[PDB]
Amino acid sequence: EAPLPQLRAYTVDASWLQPMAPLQVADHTWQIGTEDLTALLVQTAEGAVLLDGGMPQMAGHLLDNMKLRGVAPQDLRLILLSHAHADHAGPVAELKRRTGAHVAANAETAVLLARGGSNDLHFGDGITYPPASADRIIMDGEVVTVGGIAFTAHFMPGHTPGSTAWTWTDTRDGKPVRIAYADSLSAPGYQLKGNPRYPRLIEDYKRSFATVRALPCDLLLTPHPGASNWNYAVGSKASAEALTCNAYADAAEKKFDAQLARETA
Amino acid sequence: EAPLPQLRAYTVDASWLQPMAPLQVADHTWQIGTEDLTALLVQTAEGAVLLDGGMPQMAGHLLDNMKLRGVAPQDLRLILLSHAHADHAGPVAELKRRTGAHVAANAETAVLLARGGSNDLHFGDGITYPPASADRIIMDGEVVTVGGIAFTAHFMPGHTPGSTAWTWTDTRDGKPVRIAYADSLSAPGYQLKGNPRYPRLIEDYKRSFATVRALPCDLLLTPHPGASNWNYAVGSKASAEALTCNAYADAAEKKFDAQLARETA
Amino acid sequence: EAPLPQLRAYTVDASWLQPMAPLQVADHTWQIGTEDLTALLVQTAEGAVLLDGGMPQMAGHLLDNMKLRGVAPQDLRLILLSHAHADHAGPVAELKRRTGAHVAANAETAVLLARGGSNDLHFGDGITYPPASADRIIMDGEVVTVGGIAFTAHFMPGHTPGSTAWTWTDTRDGKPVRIAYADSLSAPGYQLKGNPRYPRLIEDYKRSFATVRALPCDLLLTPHPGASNWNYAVGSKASAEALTCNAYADAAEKKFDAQLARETA
Amino acid sequence: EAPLPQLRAYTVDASWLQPMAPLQVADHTWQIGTEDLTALLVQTAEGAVLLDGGMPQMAGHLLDNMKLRGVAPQDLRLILLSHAHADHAGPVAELKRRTGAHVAANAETAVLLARGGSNDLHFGDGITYPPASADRIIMDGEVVTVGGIAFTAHFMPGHTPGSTAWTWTDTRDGKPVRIAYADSLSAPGYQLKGNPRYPRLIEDYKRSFATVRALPCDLLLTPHPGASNWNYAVGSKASAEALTCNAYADAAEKKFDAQLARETA
């Protein structure tokens, strides 16, 4: 008789796990993750902020790149998240242990993080990672400030209930650069219609496309860089083809609408 | 020199703590709280549901009234909440310990419940109560079913971020009675405008008035019975003057608008 | 350049995942796990108790065997644990969701369970499973009662800080059968001496051997049946070769002492 | 008919709430609490450690005294606890929010802290305070290091299951001063014998008296300064009459034995 199946690891494309050196995005903001997963380090006079960390096994690489940027582990003040899936929040528990950083997140992200991504609305227990606690619960539009740099949360539920865009204003060449780190707008394999675990999924996505269109933004980044047409591997040309917020929302909505019709079909 | 102040207890009007015998609302639904705090018991063939419990010190009274209704402690399957303030969720931890019931709540209510109402957006630590955990996180529009009776959640944020209306269809005289247990729409002493802890407070309240207007409803009940013009003390006449959902939302919005203008003034 | 390694699944011997039909241990007590992982169902007039659940993927099998025994999911009242490693507590979160059972455990087991086995003192993040909460914290010697059957906890730290033996008295042929479900006493790959994460590891194991020797016991069972010389696959002869508590403790201490000397060498 | 009683605040002697200026204990160690509640600040080159915080309403006073010592809120790295009762752990949640400090505690202290002191083994819900999470779980004998200063945990269960002594070596006049911050050994109003919630209470206290006798110690301090014959109000003479560890343990055991006999009587 067949035994029960073995547990299956969450495996990803090699490029998601390919380390890169820090890539400067603006005067204080650096991509310090892998070629295909965003992890943004914002360096202030009173400590650093990390927005996402990628996969669980990226924790050491993140700390190495922080050190290259002059940031010792204890200099990391704050971790912010796009959403609490294993490929973006993976190393949060380990980073908290090794740095003392606090995590700020909305209540939906906090509850998913605290169960390590288990009992996911769509993926069940297939993408579990080490659980972590949120130290500060934030509300829509709330401002979190480190070293004078203000980060504003914009809720954009859909990909997860707690999906969040973060905005802040950096500089380049003496001019302001409004950065928008917008969350995923994909629905990979999701049951969109009549989903008992997420009854208003379609209404939330539709509002979130509108929220993304309206973000203050001179430079858009996304957890998966390809979603906004970044290419981290080509250095100073990485941002050349990057989408606007309007274009990112439009592409996501077209995909969503096509998926909805295919689900009907 | 003045010592630091003593801790101050959360004290309430005597009528909020005045026990009453069970008052039948419909064929399966009973008010089993106090004269001025709602606690609804819905009795099914496969166990009971409790919607709110009132103040922390009401736990024993609730269990006594459950016993009068034929419900032993272990027959309580499920606890649902309007919102996780001390005067509505107060006895949840004790009820879970004594009954084995599970709690279902949205993520905002879950995080407030788990910190016992401390660090409230408006009240600070003044209304702390024993913390409890949510066993099931629910989404807007999600259906929770016990003994075939379906309870639907309708999020109506404002009074708390996690404020929820619950609807279900009971019977009376062979006819359906659509019951709506709508949450508080008050903002007592709240800073409404430009509140850093709740930046979209006004937009949430305005949407919640609309949500309440649209609830399926033949009989409205509220956590504070006076908010919907119930009078639990007068028995079979308790519901006589009860408001419609439209009237409840209208009265709440008029009060809110007046408060907003007074806050401006 | 090498990408970072993929996540690695916790894989186990096939026999640990080999389903078996319920095997009666005494009048109310049944082995309902797999050939090589113990999961004990104790059936009372007022609901059932489950002691351990095995691997995460065993949840459905456990519920199937409960149904064969006449126990519907909602009839499971209580889950007790030997220790909160993935191969014994694996399916607890799912079982709680599907049955409404409460978990009772000591504080050490509760904290490890709530982090899903991550940040293990010896195994790091290699054996993470879905986190779950303990509904009742128990103390050493505390009695937990379901349907009149009293289960007594005996702390035996070492294999994990929260390792616990559970004892209860069942019957067979009109005579009492004192059952002892003693936890693992292995230290697989552990650094025993001068371990910064567990400074008193050796003293705890030494006391735990003594605790096991002294347990009230006519029939010993262990989370890994082979540790007490059970063979679940041979049905009515499964218990024939089972060790006494004295013999189990002696074998474990001999292995431990040999390992200590090898660690010195 | 009598309404249910109002909630009752946890009120304490005025001297427990009487602020004092920082009182130097050794070269890096300061009493910064109130006249009758200990809160120790240990200042290192890489941040500060706080051992206990007193009552919930002491948070602002603690931060004021930290500022007098040159310690900005963000310079507080670590909070350690004797035990998680409201009069010693009261302000921990607020301190974490305002400083970013992490809490290190054993599993028993962590679970009591996370429920805000509610469902206390002896006091029920009478001494609840705002819940907080432990960021690091520590084991008996484990060393926690900040700025090169090593703090060692010594478990001494009884007053609470998680009661802990902390030891570290400071200096004065060029010579080492071994400081022992030993927890409470009182059992105020406790049922000592046959306590179902704490079956091995007497055995734990008896071992804890022995643990305290054996602590490395040139200068003993206790959460209630009077328990070790300190008098914080008389400045440079505050330590003059302080007990040794042997004397503190002896006095506590004599009181305990007398209480046990009175409980028998």
Ligand SMILES: C=C1CO[C@H]([C@@](NC(=O)[C@H](C(=O)O)c2ccc(O)cc2)(OC)C(=O)O)N=C1C(=O)O
């Ligand atoms: C578009 C995708 C797809 O890849 C990841 C995702 N999914 C996967 O990596 C992948 C998949 O969807 O095929 C997956 C692999 C294994 C699983 O068990 C579950 C999901 O991460 C969990 C997801 O969120 O859907 N994330 C995104 C995204 O937009 O963030």
Ligand SMILES: C=C1CO[C@H]([C@@](NC(=O)[C@H](C(=O)O)c2ccc(O)cc2)(OC)C(=O)O)N=C1C(=O)O
């Ligand atoms: C309209 C009210 C006012 O009374 C309670 C409330 N407030 C109070 O009971 C009361 C007050 O607002 O005056 C209060 C007393 C003491 C406090 O520390 C805080 C609040 O409960 C916490 C509140 O939610 O505002 N609840 C409602 C409600 O609509 O639920």
Ligand SMILES: C=C1CO[C@H]([C@@](NC(=O)[C@H](C(=O)O)c2ccc(O)cc2)(OC)C(=O)O)N=C1C(=O)O
């Ligand atoms: C003797 C053993 C060994 O097997 C399991 C164990 N270990 C393993 O299954 C196994 C190993 O020790 O070789 C293991 C595989 C993969 C890992 O990442 C970690 C451990 O479960 C986690 C353990 O507790 O050590 N459990 C016991 C036990 O006594 O409970």
Ligand SMILES: C=C1CO[C@H]([C@@](NC(=O)[C@H](C(=O)O)c2ccc(O)cc2)(OC)C(=O)O)N=C1C(=O)O
């Ligand atoms: C000796 C005492 C007595 O005072 C406090 C204590 N108790 C009280 O402050 C006090 C009491 O025991 O009389 C109390 C007041 C009100 C309550 O609801 C409970 C306890 O703090 C919770 C306690 O731990 O027993 N603490 C100690 C101690 O040794 O830490």
Ligand code: NI
């Ligand atoms: Ni995702």
Ligand code: NI
């Ligand atoms: Ni992703």
Ligand code: NI
């Ligand atoms: Ni309220």
Ligand code: NI
């Ligand atoms: Ni209220």
Ligand code: NI
């Ligand atoms: Ni194990």
Ligand code: NI
């Ligand atoms: Ni095992």
Ligand code: NI
């Ligand atoms: Ni105490």
Ligand code: NI
């Ligand atoms: Ni005290």
